[PDB]
Amino acid sequence: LGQQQPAPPQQPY
Protein backbone atom coordinates (compact mmCIF):
# COMPACT_ATOMS: atom_id res chain seq x y z
CA LEU A 1 0.00 0.00 0.00
CA GLY A 2 0.98 3.65 -0.34
CA GLN A 3 2.77 4.13 -3.66
CA GLN A 4 3.16 0.53 -4.82
CA GLN A 5 1.71 -0.90 -8.03
CA PRO A 6 1.61 -4.20 -9.97
CA ALA A 7 4.73 -3.74 -12.09
CA PRO A 8 5.21 -5.76 -15.31
CA PRO A 9 7.01 -9.12 -15.56
CA GLN A 10 10.82 -9.14 -15.56
CA GLN A 11 12.41 -11.58 -18.00
CA PRO A 12 15.79 -10.24 -19.22
CA TYR A 13 17.47 -12.24 -21.99
State the Cα torsion 3-6-9-12 to the nearest 10°.
0
Distance of CA 2 to the CA centre of its chain: 15
Experimental technique used to determine this entry: NMR
User: Cα separation of 13 and 8, whole Å?
Assistant: 15
Distance of CA 3 to the CA centre of its chain: 12
Distance of CA 7 to the CA centre of its chain: 2
User: Cα separation of 9 and 4, whole Å?
Assistant: 15
Q: What share of the chain is helix, strand, coil (3-state, %, to 5)?
A: 0, 0, 100
Q: CA–CA distance from 9 to each of 6, 12 (Å)?
A: 9, 10
What is the radius of gyration, based on Cα positions, of the chain? 10
